Subunit: 334 residues, 5 copies
């Protein structure tokens, strides 16, 4: 029996190695396999990865006439001491178990141990949509010991920044992913003390040009279309009136359709400001002709008892104001 | 073996400490990690937190030449007595178990015990949408002992209002969160007796200005647009008629689009009252011109065999009535 | 050890109390905590409740110098006999287990037993939507023994109609709930025999006035709007034609929007009949003017080589027919 | 102890009854409780049922002074041999376990056994939507032994066609259900051999008249509406043009709305053919007037330097072609 | 007892067969039962299959007077050594367990073993939608040993390309499936070494003709409809203007409706390019008439103080440009 080469019943494996003395160092490496999904309304993401641990325990040393190591599956985990890592700020997680538990232990003759398992985790990520669609988001995954303070267990990245590897074809459908790196920081709990925490950081971006074509283009086109009435004969009322009202209807169907396709986030974003300002422009172009038609009728009635000046000024004033608004908007939102 | 320092087989751990006598006090602290989601149709919310217990048991005392405590994981829980807390009015819950069970026990030399675990819970919350979007909601989470009355177990907040801590970046996508505090109250069951219950309370609010721009603005604009026809020559029938009917169509597409984007709650809310009143105003503006055109045709036919008075009065009467409705509405709904 | 006061190893707890003789009576009480959700497409509902059992077993009697009872958690259930209740016509269910199993047993000195647990269940409910939105639905939850016929186990409500209690704030978002009561009935299985079954019954209703404002109001308004053309000068073709076609478009957008918001039930309901009849009325008003314009052109051409009679009759005939349809419809559907 | 009446430790219950000799016959009965849901996109359905087995084992015989049988719950299943049935072509399944495992065993004095359990299963069903909404679908559920060939275990329906019972109120929301019956057939696996398989078959149909009113009615009405322009004075251009373009818009909103409400199946179905043909008819009616107006203008200009023949022919030709298309369509698709 | 024919307690089944020496070969066969679902947004698919293993172990040999083998269920798996296969790049998986665990073991007298189980797996698949709806996708499922390198375990397809079988009625609702085959490749891990990996490959395609009718047809029809105004009398302003604006509205409702029905993938696809170009064409046709009407009014006013040339050129220039765009587009995207 291989479990008799390790004197399992001769030691108390409910206490850590080096109990009573300096803290035992534990090194960690991570390999990220994929990014599975992201939820903008609930503000979280899901990832699948491999987690590896490295430490030394003299109680597991065994004699050997060679330098070969012994390998075990997850059934041995319940008989020895192992570190208790958990994921901070997570919502759910599980360990894969097909066709059996995805766990491995390798023991060197001198007592060095490698501990490897495959896991899937869902973690929270606070997001800010004020600058949508030109927003940038930063996310992280955090690892910590549940019950051991820094006086008993010292947790660190085994090879610094070389301890993190990512798959060559990692991707998300609606985002671009960049800038993976690691950091560390100490955390304080009033109930028990100080703990060391490890982080994995990355950044997300959208495809701007899609949103530009999809949203900003049609609104600008309809605003330019509403200016055509300034060049039409003012005597053609049955042509001037339906044009304006139909332009208003069209802008409304555009805005409704654009709403239906964005994530349901109930506060003001940049693209709403652009859309609503454009709608106000279309509205004012209808009031302009109402004033022209009333003044012309008044003059004709007075007389019985050429281009109007308002059209001449509007032809210049409307585009300049729209250009100025665009300059200010794009200087503010980049 | 550390489990031999506690005389586990020398006591009956199916009975509480102090059995036969006064009730044993149990103190509680809570740390809230995040708010995960909220469902308006099903009327519930989900939260993740840390739950800590504190009590004393002389049967767990052990000799020591120092003042160091002993720490255990969840495997010891099945060998000793622990309190049986459950969440009242909950729909589902679970205890996190990656990479192992997220449970800890710490025992002092004199028998003081700390019991800590990490849990996620979904709880009901009755909501009232009568004043939407200007509504305010209050929610709570409740903690109680399943099997012990106040004569056997006395449950209380360990440090009063200082027993509740919340994470600095707690947030929801569509709500603002304020005013966390704790309370206590006694509850009666006819089957078994009196129990003490603990509460955690908080309040939610919406972003009003978003809904104002999104809903109230376009309806007011279309109502003002329908008044333009009062200043148009009454002889231009092919201009007057299509304007009114197209305004009605536009208001209808607005209302349908607004419905499609609100939570599916099938009873009357304030924003429906505003929308429907606006639609009635647009409808009456079309009936006005129908009457004008009939009367003018009658006069002309009679004669063969200037502004009409109705337009002159409507130009004044319609805006005043709308302003009065707005005053009453906003005095009622704040 | 408290489990030595009951002679657990001196009896066979795989057989019922009173084996060999008359059936053992078992009384039941129920406390309903909440109604969690309802699904109209799948035709089911979900509820959370407390279930309590009461029976006597002389094998559990123990000596005592007082009249105090002993209390146990779920770990004792596997050592003694307990009744095997299940829910008939259910789709899924589970027993709550945070922070431990929500089960309790209380044993009197003379052998009386109380057995209490907390459970959540999803059950089927056949619904009929023919009269929507004026429909009424009735639902039930059923309880039965899996393996014991009425010759071995007699199941009954412990206190008649007083055995059912409901929470003071039970509610659903889209329904009104009334008329809770209990009944009993015997059921026959050809495989094994007769069993007694218990029922919990209640009734659901909708908020009619919401649906009236939301659906019936706009359709009636558009039907009345289509009658305006009967009072317009027949010589104004470019006013008469676009009015009718735009009214048809508006009614179509209303019907599409109303469909998008009802539960996806693919058979004919009352509100469809009202909507479709209204659409036919709008369609006939356009055919009326087509006939008028053709006849007028024919007369003018014939002559070269006042109000038309059709308008005069339509002005009377259309509203009377619509009023008659409304009388018949509302006498049929209440 | 009742488990000592059966000599459990005197036999090897890892081998079947009659090992070494002819195959042991096993009879099956099924009672269907409900049909829970159906998914058209994923092509599967879900059902809840009772499954009963019947066989004889002389090793379970026990002495008795009467003819009474002994009943056990699921805990005895792990101590004796039982048949290993599984569901072929299923996606998920589970056995109900509230308030305990829904399993029963009944043993006669002579060794006859009844084995009963309650289960829910989701199974695949390939569907063909070519004839939608006039399609018909056939589904089945299949039962088979996992590890025993027909040489060791003989599986059959216990009472032929009388072995299948269905609940009196079984129903689905969007389908009609008819024609339950059973069959059997032998299956071959190259890895191990021949196995006998049992089937349960049934058929589904839709409510045609709903779809007729919902889809075919409005399209026919708009096609008939487009024919009105053939009777309108050709000199009234501002009446003829907007009518046609608005009819095209209305047909487009109808088709979009109809798409939004059908299951997302991305290939051509019959109702698409009808809709698209109707749209082509509306399109050609606009080209007709374009040609009329150009020819009239040419004639007038030529002259300066009554009904047109095209209208007269169109008034006859358009309805006849539409009627012929309808005859062919409904002779093809029934 | 059959488990005494195999000397289970006389061997250490924590080490592989042939420990210390050359690697043990393990052959694999796969039978695919169904394809359950596919998710385009999350980029994964789900499949149900049978997995079979074949190897030899002299420790399991037993005496026999015949050539009959012994069969066991999953309970024996925990007592002997078996291979530890897992699925690479998977998101979740499970082993079916109704009515018991779907596992089988068959042992020959000479120690040959067959190991069979039924499993369902969800696996990732990166997709590219640039050419939608004319895109083609390739997917794979991968199998690998968790803990044994190629020096200890040699994994291979048992019968080459004949080791893969697929069900005769495998299908997906929205895709066509072709070209199943197998491959193998060696993989390197810096943590432990080289491993052999097996692949199952297949290809997916869409139904093009559906998308052609659904999207490309209406846009082309509306572009052709906008050309009608070039043949209309330029003096009929109240006919020319509403036609153009209504055509713009119709194209907008078409594009919105087409968006609502495609998978929510936020980057530019081919069908967007076609739609947006068509919209620009419709927009330019309105600017054309605006210029014509202004120039005509200028000429008339100048004079007071036939076909216009622009119409004559547009009648030729617009269709040629559209045909050229179509030629380039369909030469690029096939
Ligand atoms: Cl965006 C919208 C209407 N909604 C459509 N879906 C939900 N709300 C709107 C908001 C502001 C303005 Cl100025 C115009 C419009 Cl049309
Ligand atoms: Cl809100 C709606 C129609 N619906 C749109 N989606 C669902 N119902 C409506 C209700 C009342 C009035 Cl006066 C006008 C309208 Cl347009
Ligand atoms: Cl209700 C509908 C169209 N649909 C909208 N969504 C789904 N179908 C309709 C049915 C009958 C009649 Cl007469 C008119 C109409 Cl517009
Ligand atoms: Cl059915 C559709 C547009 N879509 C709406 N939703 C998705 N596609 C269509 C197809 C063919 C024809 Cl000839 C006309 C139309 Cl409007
Ligand atoms: Cl596709 C769309 C609007 N959207 C509808 N749903 C979501 N966005 C659009 C994009 C570009 C152009 Cl040139 C015209 C239009 Cl109408
Ligand atoms: C401990 C350490 O070396 N940290 C660095 C971090 O400071 C740097 O930002 C990153 C690349 O950006 O590489 C890593
Ligand atoms: C027991 C106790 O001190 N309760 C108070 C509560 O009365 C008060 O409302 C809250 C702050 O609002 O702080 C806490
Ligand atoms: C056994 C019994 O008393 N049943 C009654 C039932 O008949 C009655 O309908 C209900 C109130 O409606 O109260 C209860
Ligand atoms: C074995 C047997 O009797 N099978 C029949 C089947 O042939 C028949 O089609 C069905 C009723 O349709 O009843 C059953
Ligand atoms: C090992 C082997 O024979 N592989 C082949 C593969 O090369 C070929 O592409 C496929 C059919 O396409 O059949 C198999
Ligand atoms: C905080 C931004 C407000 C923008 C208002 C736009 C009004 C058209
Ligand atoms: C009409 C669009 C104007 C865009 C100007 C952009 C200035 C950065
Ligand atoms: C980061 C993209 C900015 C786009 C500017 C557009 C100005 C019209
Ligand atoms: C209880 C509020 C009713 C509001 C009716 C509005 C009618 C336009
Ligand atoms: C036309 C909008 C009027 C708003 C008045 C507000 C009174 C509080
Ligand atoms: C709490 C916001 C009230 C808004 C009043 C608006 C009156 C037009
Ligand atoms: C069974 C009700 C049929 C109603 C048809 C309505 C036609 C407009
Ligand atoms: C035009 C609506 C008529 C409603 C009449 C109601 C008769 C009960
Ligand atoms: C139960 C409500 C009946 C409503 C009748 C309305 C008649 C116009
Ligand atoms: C295979 C059916 C094609 C139908 C094309 C319809 C074109 C209007
Ligand atoms: C205009 C509809 C014609 C329907 C004819 C039906 C022939 C079976
Ligand atoms: C099975 C129903 C056929 C319907 C024929 C309708 C012909 C207009
Ligand atoms: C990369 C493709 C851009 C297409 C732009 C289309 C503008 C109408
Ligand atoms: C107007 C459609 C033109 C299609 C041309 C196709 C060239 C391959
Ligand atoms: C693979 C299909 C190509 C379709 C070409 C259509 C050109 C109008
Ligand atoms: C649109 C502005 C009109 C100005 C009237 C004085
Ligand atoms: C909306 C009316 C405008 C009048 C300007 C004199
Ligand atoms: C744009 C407003 C013009 C007013 C000139 C009198
Ligand atoms: C948030 C203010 C934006 C201003 C754009 C002109
Ligand atoms: C719109 C009101 C008309 C009044 C006719 C007497
Ligand atoms: C709708 C008709 C109005 C007539 C008023 C005299
Ligand atoms: C607003 C109604 C006006 C009526 C004047 C006769
Ligand atoms: C709308 C009915 C017309 C009658 C023609 C005889
Ligand atoms: C639709 C044409 C009507 C003709 C009546 C004479
Ligand atoms: C409503 C139909 C009127 C016909 C009178 C000739
Ligand atoms: C609509 C067909 C027109 C025929 C021109 C020759
Ligand atoms: C679309 C133009 C039609 C011209 C027929 C002569
Ligand atoms: C329907 C086409 C008619 C053509 C007659 C010249
Ligand atoms: C549409 C192009 C107009 C050209 C004016 C010079
Ligand atoms: C949009 C105005 C066009 C003017 C060309 C001269
Ligand atoms: C299509 C542009 C035509 C311009 C001819 C002057
Ligand atoms: C991506 C460029 C497409 C060009 C089509 C003409
Ligand atoms: Cl006109």
């Amino acid at each position: 029996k291989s479990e008799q080469l390790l004197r399992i019943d001769d030691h108390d494996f409910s206490m850590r190695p080096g109990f009573g003395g300096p803290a035992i160092p534990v090194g960690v490496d991570v390999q990220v396999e994929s990014l599975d999904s992201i939820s903008e309304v609930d503000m979280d993401f899901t990832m699948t990865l491999y987690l590896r641990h490295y430490w030394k325990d003299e109680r597991l040393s065994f004699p050997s006439t060679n330098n070969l190591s012994m390998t075990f599956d997850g059934r041995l985990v319940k008989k020895i001491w192992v570190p208790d890592m958990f994921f901070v700020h997570s919502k759910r997680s599980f360990i894969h178990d097909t066709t059996t538990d995805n766990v491995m232990l390798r023991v060197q003759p001198d007592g060095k141990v490698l501990y490897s398992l495959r896991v899937t985790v869902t973690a929270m990520c606070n997001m800010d949509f004020s600058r949508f669609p030109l927003d940038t988001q930063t996310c992280s995954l955090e690892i910590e010991s549940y019950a051991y303070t820094e006086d008993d267990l010292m947790l660190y990245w085994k090879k610094g920044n070389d301890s993190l590897k990512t798959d060559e074809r990692i991707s998300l459908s609606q985002f671009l992913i960049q800038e993976f790196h690691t950091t560390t920081k100490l955390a304080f709990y009033s109930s028990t003390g100080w703990y060391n925490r490890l982080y994995i950081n990355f950044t997300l971006r959208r495809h701007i040009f899609f949103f530009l074509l999809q949203t900003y283009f049609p609104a600008t086109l309809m605003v330019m279309l509403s200016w055509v009435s300034f060049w039409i004969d003012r005597r053609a009322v049955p042509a001037r009136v339906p044009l304006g009202i139909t332009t208003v209807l069209t802008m409304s169907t555009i805005i409704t359709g654009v709403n239906a396709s964005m994530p349901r986030v109930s506060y003001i974003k940049a693209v709403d400001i652009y859309l609503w300002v454009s709608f106000v422009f279309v509205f004012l172009s209808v009031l302009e002709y109402a004033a022209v038609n009333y003044l012309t009728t008044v003059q004709e009635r007075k007389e019985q008892k050429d281009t109007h000046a308002i059209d001449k000024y509007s032809r210049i004033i409307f585009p300049a104001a729209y250009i100025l608004f665009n300059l200010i908007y794009w200087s503010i939102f980049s």
